[PDB]
Amino acid sequence: TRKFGLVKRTLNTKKDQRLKKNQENTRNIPQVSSALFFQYNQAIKPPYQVLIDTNFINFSIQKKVDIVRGMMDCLLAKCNPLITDCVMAELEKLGPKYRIALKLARDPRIKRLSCSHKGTYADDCLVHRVLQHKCYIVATNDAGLKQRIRKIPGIPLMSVGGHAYVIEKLPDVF
Amino acid sequence: DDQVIGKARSRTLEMRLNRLSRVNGHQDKINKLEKVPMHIRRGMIDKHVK
Amino acid sequence: MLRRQARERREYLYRKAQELQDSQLQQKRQIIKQALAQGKPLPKELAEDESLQKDFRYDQSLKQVDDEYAATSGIMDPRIIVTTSRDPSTRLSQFAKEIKLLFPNAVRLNRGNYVMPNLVDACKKSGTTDLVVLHEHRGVPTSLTISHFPHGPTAQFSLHNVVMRHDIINAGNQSEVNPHLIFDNFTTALGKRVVCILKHLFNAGPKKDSERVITFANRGDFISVRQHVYVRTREGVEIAEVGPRFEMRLFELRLGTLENKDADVEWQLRRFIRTANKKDYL
Amino acid sequence: AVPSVQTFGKKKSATAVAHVKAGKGLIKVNGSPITLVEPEILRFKVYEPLLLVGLDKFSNIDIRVRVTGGGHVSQVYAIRQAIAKGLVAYHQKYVDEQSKNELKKAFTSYDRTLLIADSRRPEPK
Amino acid sequence: FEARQRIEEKNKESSDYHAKMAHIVNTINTEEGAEKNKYERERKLR
Amino acid sequence: IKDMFSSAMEVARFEGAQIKTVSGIRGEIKRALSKPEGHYRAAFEDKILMSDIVILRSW
Amino acid sequence: VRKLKHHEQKLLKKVDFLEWKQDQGHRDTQVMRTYHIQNREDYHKYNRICGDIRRLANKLSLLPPTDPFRRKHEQLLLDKLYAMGVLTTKSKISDLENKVTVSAICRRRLPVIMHRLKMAETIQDAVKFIEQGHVRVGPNLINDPAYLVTRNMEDYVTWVDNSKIKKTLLRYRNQIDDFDFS
Amino acid sequence: FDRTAKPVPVITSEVTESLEDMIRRRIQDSNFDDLQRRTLALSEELQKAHSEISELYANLV
Ligand SMILES: [Mg+2]
Ligand SMILES: [Zn+2]
Numbered sequence: 003t004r005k006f007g008l009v010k011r012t013l014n015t016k017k018d019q020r021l022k023k024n025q026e027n028t029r030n031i032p033q034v035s036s037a038l039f040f041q042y043n044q045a046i047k048p049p050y051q052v053l054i055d056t057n058f059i060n061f062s063i064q065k066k067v068d069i070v071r072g073m074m075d076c077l078l079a080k081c082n083p084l085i086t087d088c089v090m091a092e093l094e095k096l097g098p099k100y101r102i103a104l105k106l107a108r109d110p111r112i113k114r115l116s117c118s119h120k121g122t123y124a125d126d127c128l129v130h131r132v133l134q135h136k137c138y139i140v141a142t143n144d145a146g147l148k149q150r151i152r153k154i155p156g157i158p159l160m161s162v163g164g165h166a167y168v169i170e171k172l173p174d175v176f
Numbered sequence: 177d178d179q180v181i182g183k184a185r186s187r188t189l190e191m192r193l194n195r196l197s198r199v200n201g202h203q204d205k206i207n208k209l210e211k212v213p214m215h216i217r218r219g220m221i222d223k224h225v226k
Numbered sequence: 227m228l229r230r231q232a233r234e235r236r237e238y239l240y241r242k243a244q245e246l247q248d249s250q251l252q253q254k255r256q257i258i259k260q261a262l263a264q265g266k267p268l269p270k271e272l273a274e275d276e277s278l279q280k281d282f283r284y285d286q287s288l289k290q291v292d293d294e295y296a297a298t299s300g301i302m303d304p305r306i307i308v309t310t311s312r313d314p315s316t317r318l319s320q321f322a323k324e325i326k327l328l329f330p331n332a333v334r335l336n337r338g339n340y341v342m343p344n345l346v347d348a349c350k351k352s353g354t355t356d357l358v359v360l361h362e363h364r365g366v367p368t369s370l371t372i373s374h375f376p377h378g379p380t381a382q383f384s385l386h387n388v389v390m391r392h393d394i395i396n397a398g399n400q401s402e403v404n405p406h407l408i409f410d411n412f413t414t415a416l417g418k419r420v421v422c423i424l425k426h427l428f429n430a431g432p433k434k435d436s437e438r439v440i441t442f443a444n445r446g447d448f449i450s451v452r453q454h455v456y457v458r459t460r461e462g463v464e465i466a467e468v469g470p471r472f473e474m475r476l477f478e479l480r481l482g483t484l485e486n487k488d489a490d491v492e493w494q495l496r497r498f499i500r501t502a503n504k505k506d507y508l
Numbered sequence: 509a510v511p512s513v514q515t516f517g518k519k520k521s522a523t524a525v526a527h528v529k530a531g532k533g534l535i536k537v538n539g540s541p542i543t544l545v546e547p548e549i550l551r552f553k554v555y556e557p558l559l560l561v562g563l564d565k566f567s568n569i570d571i572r573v574r575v576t577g578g579g580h581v582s583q584v585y586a587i588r589q590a591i592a593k594g595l596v597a598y599h600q601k602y603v604d605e606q607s608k609n610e611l612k613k614a615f616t617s618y619d620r621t622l623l624i625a626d627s628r629r630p631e632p633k
Numbered sequence: 634f635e636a637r638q639r640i641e642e643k644n645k646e647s648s649d650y651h652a653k654m655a656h657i658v659n660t661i662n663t664e665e666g667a668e669k670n671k672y673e674r675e676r677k678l679r
Numbered sequence: 680i681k682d683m684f685s686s687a688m689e690v691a692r693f694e695g696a697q698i699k700t701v702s703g704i705r706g707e708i709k710r711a712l713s714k715p716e717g718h719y720r721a722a723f724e725d726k727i728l729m730s731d732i733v734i735l736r737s738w
Numbered sequence: 739v740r741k742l743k744h745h746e747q748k749l750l751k752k753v754d755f756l757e758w759k760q761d762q763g764h765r766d767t768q769v770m771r772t773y774h775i776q777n778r779e780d781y782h783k784y785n786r787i788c789g790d791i792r793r794l795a796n797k798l799s800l801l802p803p804t805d806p807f808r809r810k811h812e813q814l815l816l817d818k819l820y821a822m823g824v825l826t827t828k829s830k831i832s833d834l835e836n837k838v839t840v841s842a843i844c845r846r847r848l849p850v851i852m853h854r855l856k857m858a859e860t861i862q863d864a865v866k867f868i869e870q871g872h873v874r875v876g877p878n879l880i881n882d883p884a885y886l887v888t889r890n891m892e893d894y895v896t897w898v899d900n901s902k903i904k905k906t907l908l909r910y911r912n913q914i915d916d917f918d919f920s
Numbered sequence: 921f922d923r924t925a926k927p928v929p930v931i932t933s934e935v936t937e938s939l940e941d942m943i944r945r946r947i948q949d950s951n952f953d954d955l956q957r958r959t960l961a962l963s964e965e966l967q968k969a970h971s972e973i974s975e976l977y978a979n980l981v
Contacts, residue, residue: 007865009776012767013756021756181966182800189283196261197273205274230893244827283799284831287808300958307632333633344629352632386928406952410942431957439952441943448929452939456947463947465940473931498705498724503640503925504647513916593917600919623917634930636695636923697924707924737921790980797973807970811977818981 035136035156042173043136043156048079050139052160053128054107055085056092057143061162063103070111076160076167078175084138086117088127095122125150132157139169231350235377238293254278255285262286292419294378295426303430304355309335309345317365317390324391324470325358328440328453330402330429342485350375356427359484367472372423373484379492380480381423383449388472400468401455404432410443414507416493417444420476439465447506449474513597517590518625522578524586526594530602531570537587538574550584557592560618561611569598585621592622680708680733684717693735694719701732708735773844774861780884784840791819795835822846823888848885851892867903874898 018024037045052073062069073081085107093104117127125147132138133154140151141160151159158172169175180188198206212220254272261268272278291299298304308326310318314336326332337345349357354375361369367388373380391397407428409421424442440453453469482489496502510529517524535542545551558566573590575583592615599608615622684690690711698706698721706723721733742750757764766781775781794815801808812831820828823846825837844850849864852873858864867873868883875885876894887895897904900919908914929935946952961967 006869007774007862009774010778012770013764014771015757015764015768016771022754023757178802178804179963179966181802181963181969185800185802186283192262192265193268193279193282196265196268197279200267200269201273205276208276233889233893241827244829248827248829281832281836284795284812284835287799287803287812288829288831300955335632340630348630349632351629354632387931407954408943408946408952425953425955428955430955432954439943439947441939443939443942445935445939446926446929450931450939452943454943458947463944465944465947473928475928497722498707498924503923504644514914515917516913516915597916597919601916636925636927640923640926693921695923695925695927697922735921790976794973794976794980797969797976801969801973811973815977 037136038156041156043158045137046139046158048077048081050077050079050081051137052081052083053086053131053138053140054083054112055089055124055128055140055142055144055147056096057147058141058162059093059103059107060100061143063106065162065165067162067165067167069106069109072167076169083112085112085114086124086127086131087114088117088119088122088124090114091122092124129154139172141167227351228347231377238377255282255288258282259286292422294374294376295422298355299426300430302355303331304426306332306356306358306427307335307349307354308332308358308360309337311359311361312337312340314338315362315365318360318362318367320390320392321362321367321388321470322360325360327400327402328469329427330404346373346375346483346485357484370474371484372427374423374426375483377483379419379423380482380484381420381476382478382480383474383476385472385474389470391468391470394470397468401438403436403438404429405438405440405453406432406436408439408441408443410441412444416479416507419479420449440469447475449476511602513594513601515590515594515597517586517588517593518627519578519582519585519589520628522575522582522586524573524575524583524590526590527572528594528598529570529572530568533567533569535566535571536573537571545584545587547580547584550581554584554587556588557595557615557622561595561614565595565599569595589622589625596623680721681715681718683733683735684719686717687711687713690717690719696735698733698735700727701734702728706733769841769844773841773847773850774865775844775847776883780844781840784843787843788838788840791838792835795831799835821888821890823886823892843886846886846888848880848883848887848895851887851895855892855895857895857897872898872901872903 015021015024037043054069062072067075069083073083090107093100093107119127125144128140128142128147129150132140132151136156139158139160142148143161148159148161151157152170156171159170161168161170194207255278258268258272258278260266306329308322308329310322314322319336323334326334346357357373357375359371359373360367361371368384368386369382370385371380371382405428407425412418412421421442428440437457438453438455441451443450450471450473452467452471454465454467456463456465476493477495479491479493480486480489481492496508501508512527512529515526515528517526537545542554545554571591571594573587575586575590577583578586596608596611596615599611612623684693688711690708694708694710696708698708700706700723704723704725704727706721708719708721710720712718712720739755766778770778770781795812798808798812812834816825816828816831816834819825819834819838824842825833827833827837830837848868849858849861852858852864852867853861857873858867865883868880868885871879871881873880874896875887875891879898897907904920905914908920914920
């Protein structure tokens with residue numbers, strides 16, 4: 003009556019609990035914007051607020067366009083430039099050869115705003131803000147960032163060209 | 177190629193296919209270097225360069 | 227026993243499946259053979275691979291009669307049993323006798339009160355290589371089914387322009403020497419299949435001076451069989467025809483035994499297709 | 509439980525099922541007593557096992573026979589084989605082995621088709 | 634006999650047609666394409 | 680097929696030919712029967728129904 | 739033993755009381771579990787036979803390719819293994835090198851053959867049946883549960899007559915034939 | 921109209937003579953097919969390796 007086919011009480015790896023590699027074992031849908039049409043972006047009216055990035059500052063100084071006047075040149079109306087603390091740190095960690103561009107980009111006409119994230123992947127900080135609030139316009143010259151904020155709906159992108167600036171998606175430049 | 181026998185033959189075959197794949201492959205999957213922990217590999221390369 | 231044949235057919239089918247999925251592998255190994263034979267660029271997939279370039283020692287050490295016949299091609303001379311359809315007719319009886327005489331190692335079986343599975347299993351129990359079953363219409367022979375027994379293949383031919391030997395002439399008796407064979411104009415892999423089944427249907431290993439010839443010629447997808455005796459003259463070697471003549475034509479081909487009716491069809495004559503008149507062998 | 513036993517009998521293409529259980533000493537074949545099998549010249553051939561052995565051993569049991577398929581003589585040989593193997597099985601299961609053996613000896617000495625059938629498979633040369 | 638002759642003829646004519654069409658389209662293919670890519674090689678350089 | 684032809688030798692004059700049904704399936708006309716007078720037999724590539732209709736293109 | 743916290747973990751990276759480097763994934767245990775076998779010694783002896791086969795294939799590789807010794811010997815070994823039952827496909831001598839597993843031998847074992855032929859229901863139950871003595875190989879029965887069986891006896895494995903198992907089977911099909919007292 | 925099949929060939933005199941001259945040509949070439957019965961030092965270190973592998977092989981079998 004001793005139970006037939008008994009076996010030594012071994013240790014599983016596919017079932018047990020004390021293995022650290024075996025220890026690891028209401029939907030959400032973000033809505034589309036009230037301030038976004040199909041593609042019109044009904045919200046933005048002048049004045050505008052722009053976000054400046056490291057590539058934008060670089061090509062700005064390499065083509066000699068002063069910041070605020072070049073912005074008025076591009077946009078034909080009133081606009082305010084903003085940089086984020088992550089972007090400032092990005093220029094800083096680029097460092098000693100571009101310190102003149104740093105001393106330029108720090109100017110008390112540029113009202114810097116503060117971020118709260120680990121890491122300084124300024125691409126991530128930018129795109130998280132712009133999918134967060136849909137009212138900034140974004141100036142840069144990175145190709146990948148250009149493609150991404152092209153993929154997003156209803157956000158005008160702004161880059162350099164020749165000796166002036168240009169914008170991509172804005173339905174009212176003129 | 178017939179009187180070759182054993183370890184010699186194995187290393188020859190490896191080197192032949194190595195070049196014949198290196199001429200058109202991606203260099204990573206051509207020569208993936210085999211794994212070894214860091215201090216022992218660095219000790220080996222130190223002794224060899226010495 | 228019957229279980230042994232069952233799992234035999236199982237293992238044969240599995241080896242066929244593995245053969246299919248290893249064809250391409252055989253191609254890649256042949257390509258690598260050629261590359262090592264002459265140093266050249268090696269192309270993309272096999273170049274990037276690691277398992278092939280690792281296991282190619284045994285593979286380099288690696289490296290034709292069809293498989294259903296493969297073990298006993300030219301060792302055990304085959305035995306054939308020829309039997310008649312059902313409640314036979316007398317003209318058919320004479321002609322089936324003539325077929326039994328035409329082949330060597332042949333025995334005849336009248337069939338009344340039999341069933342196909344009982345017959346085929348009894349023949350397998352006895353131990354017999356190859357089987358021939360005849361069907362007729364109104365005296366005229368028209369249909370013939372050949373089977374090879376250890377779950378081998380079957381072929382079904384029609385046959386039309388038959389003349390019995392006695393109704394050629396009241397001549398005499400044949401010699402029944404182990405004959406010879408000639409195969410003309412065979413092209414396709416199907417052609418190789420049918421010459422293989424008929425070669426293993428004949429006797430195996432004939433002499434050097436045997437004096438009976440049996441032909442097989444493809445004349446527009448109608449296999450014409452004749453049979454002649456020859457005696458070698460000095461300048462024009464004379465052939466005397468003897469034995470029946472008839473026009474034979476394939477129409478289907480099964481990979482099982484004839485009792486199955488639902489094995490794997492490895493060929494089947496298409497009739498109502500747009501290009502039926504058009505192709506040869508199709 | 510009821511001490512019971514079951515057997516089969518088989519000519520060329522017929523089937524004879526035979527239940528054998530303890531009872532009052534009767535026979536039943538297809539819901540009809542065995543004075544009424546049909547062919548009336550082979551009724552004695554059906555009777556053959558009983559008249560071979562005796563009658564008391566069939567006075568203390570109960571048979572129930574049901575046959576399907578086949579033709580006349582085939583059914584008849586089927587019933588006789590079924591009755592034979594059923595009686596032998598009942599004796600083997602519930603009474604003495606010595607009685608089973610003397611039964612088997614008397615049967616097979618008479619005619620072996622009672623205890624084993626021959627399904628006639630041909631002989632090809 | 635009529636059957637064999639008519640069908641043999643039809644197969645003959647279908648083969649004829651296919652060969653002729655393949656010839657014409659392949660001639661024009663290779664030659665006119667050689668001209669078109671000669672001009673591509675020039676217009677890239679112009 | 681029953682009502683395509685009138686006489687047996689007429690059937691045989693057309694024998695061995697290609698015939699499609701209005702359903703769209705193929706077949707061939709082969710031989711003449713005996714006991715009726717115009718009927719012939721044919722083989723299709725699939726089971727015909729009853730309500731079908733057979734036609735024969737000719738020029 | 740604590741789910742010990744951050745700093746003490748980053749100090750005690752390499753400690754592990756459960757799985758060591760040397761018991762490579764507890765491979766022996768996992769295969770033992772999948773095929774319900776009884777002794778660690780059974781696993782390790784199957785390991786040794788596998789290892790000797792692979793050293794043979796390695797020296798056969800180290801021989802030059804076109805020797806008829808090499809060809810004939812490797813082909814003969816492939817006959818031996820294909821009739822033995824361990825490896826499936828006779829053609830890839832790579833699969834001589836690379837497919838030969840203790841899993842393959844242990845699945846050629848007896849109870850896996852029962853689960854193959856759908857005799858028993860699952861493998862542990864098959865081990866119960868072979869231990870209890872209801873299943874015979876040809877003319878004699880088996881009590882050592884760890885029987886190896888080639889193809890030519892896979893053909894003859896069956897249940898023993900006048901077992902209550904065969905009784906239940908033919909009773910459900912309504913075909914117990916108690917002249918044989920099956 | 922549109923026919924569908926190759927009718928069965930009427931064997932005639934000239935076809936038989938074509939076949940005759942085929943068989944006779946193959947006779948006077950004497951090339952006819954059949955299935956004939958299936959029929960059936962080196963180096964120091966190589967003999968060393970053969971010896972070792974053969975001993976090991978026998979032990980393994
Ligand atoms: Mg960047
Ligand atoms: Zn930031």
